[PDB]
Amino acid sequence: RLAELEEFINGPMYDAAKLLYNNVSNFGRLASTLVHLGEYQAAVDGARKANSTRTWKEVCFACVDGKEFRLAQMCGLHIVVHADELEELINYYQDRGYFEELITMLEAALGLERAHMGMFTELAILYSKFKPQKMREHLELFWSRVNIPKVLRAAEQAHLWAELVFLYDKYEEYDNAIITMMNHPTDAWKEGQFKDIITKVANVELYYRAIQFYLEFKPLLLNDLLMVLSPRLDHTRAVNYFSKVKQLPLVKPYLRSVQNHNNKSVNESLNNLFITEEDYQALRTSIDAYDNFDNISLAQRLEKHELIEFRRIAAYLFK
């Protein structure tokens, strides 16, 4: 020990070289041997002085092997910042099965001034398959600083529907956000945002596919939803469906809201309602303001009605 301590340090083996490399100050191997000597905490000092990447990898990895984590962490925050290195560092903490610590480190890295995309993208991914509850609040803050396509394929695989919509939304892949809110309603579906995304949708067919969904599982919301679909909705096609599905009394609010298009199936459909609900004043106005309908059919149908207000209308229709 002191044998070479006062000899090499007098004038111009892991424990001997430890001193040798120490005076020449080749921290590259000073740190390397310190590890190879189980003197971890100090080896992280040599790696600091050595200020080398390939060097922190030797120390960090071994520091891991020795299951020294608070060390392997601060000794790992010097590597994550290096995109070209981020992967091997993760793939290493993975096979050693230390997924818990790997995600505890990245937790801090995020703070680092040199924190990049590859980090946020990788934390999300991990979070999905190891801490789903966090997966949300994470995208909530760093959805902009992450490779979206990869994070999606990662929630798709992790059935995190609520989040999937979030991103599909941000990534402006609206058709997908809707399709998703529609197959996994409990999770994803939210009344308000459905009425905001649906619009952006590209493939209009989804409207008719949504109408059906809302109609079969959410009746009270079908009208307010129809109101937003109006501009691009093929009303004749819409009314036909509701009619075949004998649901026209439910979409009344919508029918009135559209009738002003003097659409036929609309008037005919709308008029049948005023009739079954003995609303003759409303019927009068309808056959007065909008004329696209078969008056003789109506006329004939009404001339047989038991209510005088209607029989009078029939007469008016025939004239």
Curated annotation (Swiss-Prot):
Domain notes: The C-terminal third of the heavy chains forms the hub of the triskelion. This region contains the trimerization domain and the light-chain binding domain involved in the assembly of the clathrin lattice. The N-terminal seven-bladed beta-propeller is formed by WD40-like repeats, and projects inward from the polyhedral outer clathrin coat. It constitutes a major protein-protein interaction node.
Region annotation (Involved in binding clathrin light chain) ranges: 16-319
Protein localization: Cytoplasmic vesicle membrane; Membrane, Coated pit; Melanosome; Cytoplasm, Cytoskeleton, Spindle
Phosphotyrosine modifications at: Y280, Y290
Segments annotated as CHCR repeats: 77-223, 226-319
Description of how the protein assembles with itself and partners: Clathrin triskelions, composed of 3 heavy chains and 3 light chains, are the basic subunits of the clathrin coat. In the presence of light chains, hub assembly is influenced by both the pH and the concentration of calcium. Interacts with HIP1. Interacts with DENND1A, DENND1B and DENND1C. Interacts with OCRL. Interacts with ERBB2. Interacts with FKBP6. Interacts with CKAP5 and TACC3 forming the TACC3/ch-TOG/clathrin complex located at spindle inter-microtubules bridges; the complex implicates clathrin triskelions; TACC3 and CLTC are proposed to form a composite microtubule interaction surface.
Modified residues (N6-acetyllysine): K244, K304
Job description of the protein: Clathrin is the major protein of the polyhedral coat of coated pits and vesicles. Two different adapter protein complexes link the clathrin lattice either to the plasma membrane or to the trans-Golgi network. Acts as a component of the TACC3/ch-TOG/clathrin complex proposed to contribute to stabilization of kinetochore fibers of the mitotic spindle by acting as inter-microtubule bridge. The TACC3/ch-TOG/clathrin complex is required for the maintenance of kinetochore fiber tension. Plays a role in early autophagosome formation.
Family, similarity comment: Belongs to the clathrin heavy chain family.
Name of this chain's protein: Clathrin heavy chain 1
Part of the full-length chain shown: 1182 to 1516 of 1675
N6-succinyllysine PTM sites in chain numbering: K244
Modified residues (Phosphoserine): S32, S297
